Amino acid sequence: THDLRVSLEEIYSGCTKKMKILTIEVKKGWKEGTKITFPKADIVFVLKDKPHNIFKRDGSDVIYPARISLREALCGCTVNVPTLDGRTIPVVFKDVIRPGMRRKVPGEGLPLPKTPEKRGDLIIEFEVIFPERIPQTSRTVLEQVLPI
Amino acid sequence: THDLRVSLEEIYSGCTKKMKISHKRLNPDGKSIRNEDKILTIEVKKGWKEGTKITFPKEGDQTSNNIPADIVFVLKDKPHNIFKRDGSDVIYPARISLREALCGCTVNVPTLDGRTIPVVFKDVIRPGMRRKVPGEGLPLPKTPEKRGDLIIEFEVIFPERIPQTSRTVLEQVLPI
Missing domain, CATH: 2.60.260.20 (Urease metallochaperone UreE, N-terminal domain)
Structure with a gap:
């Protein structure tokens, strides 16, 4: 073997x-x-x-980890997703992105082995990067704009 | 099984x-089978x-002239709706707001015997962060006098939506 x-x-x-x-x-x-x-x-x-250093494989789908700042998650984000044949597709998010949120990019996965003309999906998987620390100044403002 | x-x-x-x-039992007549609890x-x-x-x-079934x-x-x-078991550890999902994650919060951690242990966090809490509460898990089965840990695991709950005026402000205070 x-x-x-x-x-x-x-x-x-x-x-x-x-x-x-x-x-x-x-x-x-x-x-x-x-x-x-x-x-x-x-x-x-x-x-x-x-x-692989860009994608995790999941059957015929591939998962793309997108690391974005908390600022992007809350305020608006464009992910330029890489493709298997080395282009990128811009995917624009206008709503709040949550930790671990996924977004399907259909047909951008791998060929299905029995029907190789058909492809799985590319799945964006968000990791939201928090600031290391918040200054007292910022804390004060966050307390005014964010829900308790 | x-x-x-x-x-x-x-x-x-x-x-x-x-x-x-309930198990099956061959009756004295050797023909019929009964069901008893x-x-x-x-x-x-x-x-x-x-x-x-x-x-x-x-203690199982007997439908035959032999040992059941x-x-x-x-x-x-x-x-359990409060904790997840992880060996001799128990995990406690702590759902907090984004505000609490960034600005500080206290988590009142429930225990298996029904206390809460307050745990105060002053630094940024990250999504998925864990904090161990030593000895507040389950007894180690081989040494039941000793215990595993209770682990706080953070889930950070984002706002559903953010108005434009709030976005303008968060853009000024949150790093790029």
């Missing part, structure tokens, strides 16, 4: 992996756990998602 | 549960974990 470590990009487009023990054809959208047998003692491979 | 649902309070102090079960008594010890198994030998089957209870944590 041998682990086959595939990046998100390789799941998205599909690829050829030449293994030096042997050629494996990774079909687009294939999910961690997919087994790829060889007659050559039967050497069986198993598909594993390599960690 | 039957579920034995036990409250956090019952795990905290221990308890004696009495479970009414039996009440089994289970002592739940301080700190027992979910998954703990309690076996009542030969077994009943196995599996301890399950009954959902």
